[PDB]
């Protein structure tokens, strides 16, 4: 029984929040302070077993940690989807305006 994995993912938290394991990097522009500095660090250090693990990225400033804490409610994690992370698609997913 054949499934479109992207459509299916839209019915998970991936369709509701920024998925630190899958979502394209431009999504971090949605919230104050995340783009591009933290966005880059998050994508680079993915995947994460839980949202809070984002706080464990090396080199972070205290300011950066606090911004991350204030924005955990906007994050989720789901299993890595090959279709969303191949092709360097997390950095450029072929969508502009």
């Amino acid at each position: 029984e054949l499934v479109n994995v992207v459509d299916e993912k839209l019915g998970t938290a991936y369709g509701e929040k920024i998925d630190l394991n899958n979502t394209n990097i431009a999504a971090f522009i949605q919230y104050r302070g995340l783009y591009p500095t933290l966005a880059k660090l998050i994508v680079k250090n993915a995947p994460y077993e839980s949202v809070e693990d984002v706080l464990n990225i090396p080199g972070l400033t205290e300011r950066q940690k606090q911004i991350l804490r204030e924005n955990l409610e906007h994050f989720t994690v789901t299993e890595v989807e090959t279709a969303l992370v191949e092709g360097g698609d997390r950095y450029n997913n072929g969508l502009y305006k």
């Binding site: 522009i29 919230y31 104050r32 783009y35 591009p36 500095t37 305006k97």
Partner: protein
């Protein structure tokens, strides 16, 4: 419909103060925006980085906030990335980099205010078209 004093009334700062631009300032703002900015920012988008637009809601969530005259005027002197983290004058037109972006050389403080006012007034006129791109043409 008219370009009224209310349409021309935009936030001066983050502290609740507004400024009412004159019709001539609005015209100057359009002219100067076309002169210095529209090559990349036509219609409120950004051609060399479409992820970032000139929508008011977008400017509000920028760091420091850019949804007011002061924020925009400061951007034009000392532009930063969206999180305020790096200064990008070396790759983005500004007064600080008027040496490498020569069109910025003749821009006065008054000019910057006019450009800032254009950026804030235009979406009040154009709605979703401003920063919308081709979808809304």
């Amino acid at each position: 419909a008219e370009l009224t004093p209310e349409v021309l009334t935009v936030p001066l700062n983050s502290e609740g103060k507004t400024i009412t631009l004159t019709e001539k300032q609005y015209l100057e703002g359009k002219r100067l925006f076309q002169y210095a900015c529209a090559s990349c920012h036509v219609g409120g988008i950004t051609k060399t980085n479409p992820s970032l637009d000139l929508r008011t809601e977008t400017l509000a969530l920028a760091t420091p906030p850019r949804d007011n005259i002061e924020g925009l005027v400061d951007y034009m002197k000392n532009p930063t990335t969206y999180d305020g983290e790096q200064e990008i004058a070396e790759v983005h037109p500004s007064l600080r980099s008027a040496d490498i972006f020569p069109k910025m050389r003749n821009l006065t403080e008054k000019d910057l205010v006019a450009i800032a006012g254009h950026i804030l007034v235009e979406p009040k006129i154009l709605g979703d078209k401003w920063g919308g791109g081709k979808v809304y043409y």
